[PDB]
Structure 1
Amino acid sequence: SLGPQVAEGENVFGVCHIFASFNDTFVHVTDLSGKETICRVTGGMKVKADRDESSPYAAMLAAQDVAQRCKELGITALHIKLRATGGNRTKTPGPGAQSALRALARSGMKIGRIEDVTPIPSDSTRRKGGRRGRRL
C-alpha cells in the first residue's frame, strides 16, 4: 500500500463529489485537483431494486465502501462538494445526501470544508413537460 509518504502529522486531503438525485446517488473521490480520480461508488451497485437506488441505506453502504478504499490507498481527509441535479431541474439535494455525508464521519475519514456546487442558470432553456406540467 503506497500513498503520500507523510500522514502522521498532517492529513492528506481529497474531494468527495456527492451527487444526490431523486433517482440515484454517487459518491466520487478524486485528488485535490479533480482530474485524477479514486474509487467511485454508486447507489445502484449496492441494491437490486431501481426504486431503492435513491435511499439513505444505499447511500451509507456506498459511503462505507468509498471510505474503506480511501483509507486503504493513501487518503485520511476529505473536502465535500454537494450536488443536486441543478439547472432546468429539481435544484434540491435528494434523500441520500444527508446519509452519505455522515457515513463518512462514522467511518474514520476526516472532514474539511463543505460546499454546495449545484449548477444554476442566469436564465434557462425551456423545461420539459409542456405548459400544463406533468399532471399525474
Structure 2
Amino acid sequence: EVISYGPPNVGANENVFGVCHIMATWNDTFIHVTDLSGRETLVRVTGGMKVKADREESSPYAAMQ
C-alpha cells in the first residue's frame, strides 16, 4: 500500500497541524503549507500553476484549484 510520511501517529481524535500561509495580490495568489515553525516547506500552489492567461493568475477559480 501507500507509504505516507506524516509522523508515525494516527487517531481520528488526534489533530495534525499545518500552517497555511496565503498571500492574495490583485495579480497573483499564493497558498503555502508548512510546519508550525515554518522552516520546512511542504505544499505550494499558486494561481499561475492553475491557468493560462496572466490576467487570471489571480481569479476565484485559480484559488479553488
Scaled by the length of structure 1, what TM-score is found?
0.43
CA distance in 2, matches of 1:2, 1:39: 14
Could you list the per-position Cα deviations for residues 7-38 of structure 1 after superposition, in whole angstroms to 9, with x for gaps in the alignment? 31311101110110000000000111001110
Identify the residue that residue 25 of structure 2 maps to in structure 1: 21
Q: Which runs of 5+ in 2 are unaligned?
A: none
Match of 2:9 among 6, 9, 31: 6
Q: Is 1:56 aligned to residue 60 of structure 2? A: yes
> How many angstroms does 1:39 deviate by?
1.4
Q: Which is richer in helix?
A: 1
Q: Report the 3-state secondary structure (helix = DSSP H, G, I; strand = E; otherwise coil) of the residue aligned with 1:24.
A: coil
Q: Report the 3-state secondary structure (helix = DSSP H, G, I; strand = E; otherwise coil) of the residue aligned with 1:25.
A: coil
Q: Name the % identity.
A: 75
CA distance in 2, matches of 1:40, 1:48: 18
Q: Which runs of 5+ in 1 are unaligned?
A: 62-136
CA distance in 2, matches of 1:47, 1:60: 11
Could you list the per-position Cα deviations for residues 84-131 of structure 1 after superposition, in whole angstroms to 9, with x for gaps in the alignment? xxxxxxxxxxxxxxxxxxxxxxxxxxxxxxxxxxxxxxxxxxxxxxxx
**Runs of 4+ displaced beyond 6 Å:** none
Which structure: larger Rg?
1
Q: Report the 3-state secondary structure (helix = DSSP H, G, I; strand = E; otherwise coil) of the residue aligned with 2:23.
A: strand
Identify the residue that residue 39 of structure 2 maps to in structure 1: 35
Identify the residue that residue 69 of structure 1 maps to in structure 2: none
**How much is the aligned-residue C-alpha RMSD, in angstroms?**
0.9
Aligned residues: 61
Contact kept? 1:25, 1:53, Cα under 8 Å: yes
Scaled by the length of structure 2, what TM-score is found?
0.87
